[model samples]
Target chain A: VDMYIERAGDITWEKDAEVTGNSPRLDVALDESGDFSLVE
Target chain B: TTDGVYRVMTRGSTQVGVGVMQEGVFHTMWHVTKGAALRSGEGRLDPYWGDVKQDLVSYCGPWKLDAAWDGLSEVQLLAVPPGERAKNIQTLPGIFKTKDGDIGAVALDYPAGTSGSPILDKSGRVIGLYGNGVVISYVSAITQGKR
Candidate 1:
């Protein structure tokens, strides 16, 4: 039997505050295709 | 990047694993914590943990990625249709700290391309977004421009 699971809706969210400015959030990905085009 | 993860590539070099169109205020939308990072600068590499360090310079922005990436405008985005979501996480995600004192969820791992993936609860809610910390682990704090 598993134990209780389900976070409180009130849990503190961090990223929400980490973001700065109102710049448009990037919504697309370049179709890297090779899957591993490059990593640096 | 995880082989099976739902990796989405924005620009030419910015790849975010696990994404979905989440509408935000105005024309903005929220999906994973990822979106375009500060989009200006020549890309470079920095040293890793215990490397005696960036005393080594880590690349800060995406300016050095590819001209192919520059062709796209900042507003351009490939809508990610619904796909596999990282599940089986703890009910309450605890904070994970790095050697440099960073933070994120211990229940999740922030791989190379998983910066913007959303951290959801059992009920399928965006409880948190993944952050690409200094290293590729659960570290959610962004560390660059050091050395």
Candidate 2:
């Protein structure tokens, strides 16, 4: 069986969204406007 | 994991989600996608599938109810022989084990594995969402007091 996930946008690296003691956190843009990036 | 434009999987015209009925009102559900490709941390969407250390705890929709969900408890499953290709959408029967209140996730010990299977009570109510060879917990923040 296969399951699909909806991609919000391209993944990028950010330091602010990084977990404590972790570097280069990965984030995703929620929309085309690029106002938000969810931290992983 | 491979990178590609993400899409929702649909069985015919129906987008599948965990279904639960409350006071005659039916609603689809949300669960944590283990090693998920998509996620949210700051109340927005994020991608995490490529990273082995990440798990996406996100919510899916309130999909339209499947009216045929009734009488679902009696569904049967058969194990495919070695080297045999199993057909799509096959049901594998499982036993309902105990549930963990700490995480609110239900445990199902099915010999065939629990992926894509529904966890039903004795009266055939869809209790929790199934995936990753086990039943996952649901988001009850918005669902409490309704059912």
Candidate 3:
């Protein structure tokens, strides 16, 4: 349900936890390898 | 010195959040309040409720944010791609008040930026938000509120 980014450069989004399509549904995470790199 | 809406957009959107009553075909864009905000990949906070694909610029435009916020929730901001469709370009000025004097679905119209204008809250804090002239008549007949 909550998300956080740690540093600069190409960022990463990880699914540290798991869930099915149902059950406490808010806890799902974006598929790993993060999102993308931060450009300067 | 002082300036009208033009200078207001520059300083207001870039530095401080200024309040403006959208009138007279100034920029011609729509301000969408996203139901959520995103923490952009570029490291800036963004909207969960707005249009990222809309044709627009931001002195400070509101977006629906995802993460890395200033602790502000429900809305975020950005200068987005221009040339899309936006309705209800605010003709009336709206004050940057609060939702029931708190935070929720309430919207105000202020210029964009991180500082400068009176992005006043009922909690007595200047949120980094701008005026959009969206609700001037409903609140008070005041046209705008700037610093």
How many clashing residue pairs appear in each of the predictions shown? 13, 0, 51
Candidate 2: segments with Cα more than 4 A from true spot: A1-40, B1-116, B132-147
What docking tier does model 3 reach?
incorrect
Which lDDT value does model 2 have at A15?
Answer: 22
CA RMSD for every model?
18.4, 18.6, 20.2
**Candidate 3: residue B91 lDDT (0-100):** 21
Q: Rank the candidates by lDDT, best first.
A: 1, 2, 3
Q: List, residue by residue over B51-76, the lDDT tens digit for candidate 3.
A: 22222222224321112213232222
- Residue pairs with colliding backbones in model 2 are none
Q: What part of the reference interface contacts, as a 0 to 1 fraction, does candidate 3 reproduce?
A: 0.00
Locate the minimum summed-lDDT window of 10 residues in model 1 chain A: A1-10
DockQ for every model comes to 0.03, 0.05, 0.02
Instruction: Quote the lDDT for B43 in model 3.
Output: 38
TM-score of 2: 0.22
Of 2 and 3, the candidate ranking higher by DockQ = 2
DockQ preference between candidates 1 and 3, better one: 1
Task: Give the winner by TM-score.
Answer: 1
- State the lDDT at A3 in candidate 3: 20
Candidate 1 per-residue lDDT over residues B92-144, each given as its tens digit: 33332333332222223435444434443333334333443222323332112
Candidate that beats the other on DockQ, 1 or 2, i.e. the better one: 2
**Model 1 stretches with alpha carbons more than 4 Å out:** A1-40, B1-7, B10-14, B24-92, B96-104, B132-137, B141-147
